[PDB]
Amino acid sequence: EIIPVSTTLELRAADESHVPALHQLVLKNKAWLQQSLDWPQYVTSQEETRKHVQGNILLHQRGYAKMYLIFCQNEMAGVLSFNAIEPINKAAYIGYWLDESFQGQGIMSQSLQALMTHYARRGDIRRFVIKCRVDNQASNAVARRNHFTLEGCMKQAEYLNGDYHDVNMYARIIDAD
Amino acid sequence: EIIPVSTTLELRAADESHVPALHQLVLKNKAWLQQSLDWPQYVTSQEETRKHVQGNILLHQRGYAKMYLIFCQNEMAGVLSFNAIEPINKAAYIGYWLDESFQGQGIMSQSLQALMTHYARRGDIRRFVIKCRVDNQASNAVARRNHFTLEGCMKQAEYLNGDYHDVNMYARIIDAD
Numbered sequence: 001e002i003i004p005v006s007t008t009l010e011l012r013a014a015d016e017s018h019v020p021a022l023h024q025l026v027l028k029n030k031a032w033l034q035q036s037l038d039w040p041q042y043v044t045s046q047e048e049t050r051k052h053v054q055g056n057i058l059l060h061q062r063g064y065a066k067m068y069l070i071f072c073q074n075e076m077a078g079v080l081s082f083n084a085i086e087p088i089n090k091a092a093y094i095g096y097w098l099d100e101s102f103q104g105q106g107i108m109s110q111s112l113q114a115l116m117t118h119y120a121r122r123g124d125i126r127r128f129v130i131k132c133r134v135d136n137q138a139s140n141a142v143a144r145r146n147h148f149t150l151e152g153c154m155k156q157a158e159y160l161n162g163d164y165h166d167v168n169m170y171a172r173i174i175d176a177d
Numbered sequence: 178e179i180i181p182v183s184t185t186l187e188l189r190a191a192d193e194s195h196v197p198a199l200h201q202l203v204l205k206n207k208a209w210l211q212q213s214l215d216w217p218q219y220v221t222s223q224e225e226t227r228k229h230v231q232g233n234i235l236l237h238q239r240g241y242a243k244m245y246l247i248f249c250q251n252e253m254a255g256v257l258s259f260n261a262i263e264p265i266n267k268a269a270y271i272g273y274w275l276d277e278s279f280q281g282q283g284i285m286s287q288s289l290q291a292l293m294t295h296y297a298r299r300g301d302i303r304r305f306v307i308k309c310r311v312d313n314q315a316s317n318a319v320a321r322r323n324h325f326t327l328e329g330c331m332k333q334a335e336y337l338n339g340d341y342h343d344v345n346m347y348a349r350i351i352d353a354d
């Protein structure tokens with residue numbers, strides 16, 4: 001399962017074969033990922049990433065979540081995913097991160113747009129949501145460029161780096177009729 | 178486990194012994210509950226309520242959710258609960274409903290306040306949230322009387338009664354220091 005993004009980019013569904021490369025990518029970025037994600041601190045050994053992946057693959061096959069790996073000229077560059085899918089509401093919560101050396105190239109912006117369009121077209125997701133610290137300006141720029149509307153500010157909603165942070169909730173509705 | 182509310186009210190932790198009475202209460206109110214809750218339509222037989230209860234009791238014991246039954250002069254009057262608890266964020270999502278014949282007496286308002294105070298005092302929950310259709314004025318009045326702040330409006334976020342509804346997100350932070 002591959003969702004095309006561009007002549008140099010593609011989304012591949014999470015595989016057990018990706019575990020090794022992804023573990024290294026996580027290691028290389030966890031110091032800075034920790035400021036806006038919670039799970040990187042619990043990742044130490046490859047076994048823990050494999051665990052996260054096998055679990056994700058299941059929710060992925062059942063349609064309860066999705067995990068895609070972003071590939072740039074056959075090189076793993078980051079992860080784009082639906083952390084949770086509420087089938088009855090056709091709503092999904094988005095999560096993503098990019099290896100620091102693949103940033104600043106519009107890679108995530110384009111991947112998100114290709115991913116959303118694909119699901120709005122299939123029709124099982126029409127409402128997309130992005131929740132992230134209010135102060136993560138890079139993620140906010142990805143959401144706005146993808147036409148997300150800020151719905152609210154959740155006060156001190158997430159505990160990250162020994163402190164509570166206000167979280168913005170961005171959403172976009174796409175009815176691909 | 179009983180959390181006191183008033184000389185005529187109390188909160189009792191969900192029990193297997195409550196299943197029968199609760200099933201009847203659900204039956205008596207599901208026609209109208211369906212307009213703002215999704216699970217009442219899946220409840221037909223007592224076995225299904227027992228299922229919902231045994232599951233809840235587990236999340237309750239693990240601290241991942243809570244389910245309390247509201248009792249009014251030893252008579253079951255409704256349910257008040259934390260649908261989900263995010264331990265790391267000390268945040269909880271509230272759910273509640275009252276049998277139609279126990280409404281209009283400030284019973285839910287008082288029960289919610291007693292419940293929140295008890296958890297903010299214990300310190301494992303400091304952020305309380307209420308999400309419900311924007312047009313449910315009775316629930317909105319319970320949230321405002323309990324000093325919740327409206328954080329945002331989630332567009333067409335819930336599918337209920339064959340249609341999508343805008344959902345308000347109310348929140349309150351309590352640091353019982």
Ligand SMILES: *SCCNC(=O)CCNC(=O)[C@H](O)C(C)(C)COP(=O)(O)OP(=O)(O)OC[C@H]1O[C@@H](n2cnc3c(N)ncnc32)[C@H](O)[C@H]1OP(=O)(O)O
Binds near residue numbers: 037095097110138
């Ligand atoms: S809490 C939920 C959010 N997750 C995280 O915060 C995870 C940690 N952060 C990241 O991994 C990272 O900061 C993310 C993926 C959020 C954003 O990274 P980028 O800023 O690299 O995003 P993107 O890959 O979309 O690149 C946009 C930027 O690239 C430049 N640029 C050049 N060319 C383009 C094109 N053609 N299209 C769009 N952008 C392009 C811009 O300088 C950057 O754009 P901004 O305007 O978004 O700053």
Ligand SMILES: *SCCNC(=O)CCNC(=O)[C@H](O)C(C)(C)COP(=O)(O)OP(=O)(O)OC[C@H]1O[C@@H](n2cnc3c(N)ncnc32)[C@H](O)[C@H]1OP(=O)(O)O
Binds near residue numbers: 213273274285
């Ligand atoms: S989607 C998440 C919300 N859940 C649901 O909507 C579930 C379905 N609805 C209900 O079960 C029900 O409508 C709920 C529980 C939301 C609200 O019911 P009540 O309106 O009966 O609330 P409560 O029990 O808090 O009673 C308040 C009302 O009672 C009157 N009243 C008399 N005396 C008092 C006192 N002492 N204190 C407060 N209220 C009191 C008021 O006439 C009603 O108050 P409002 O001002 O809230 O309308």
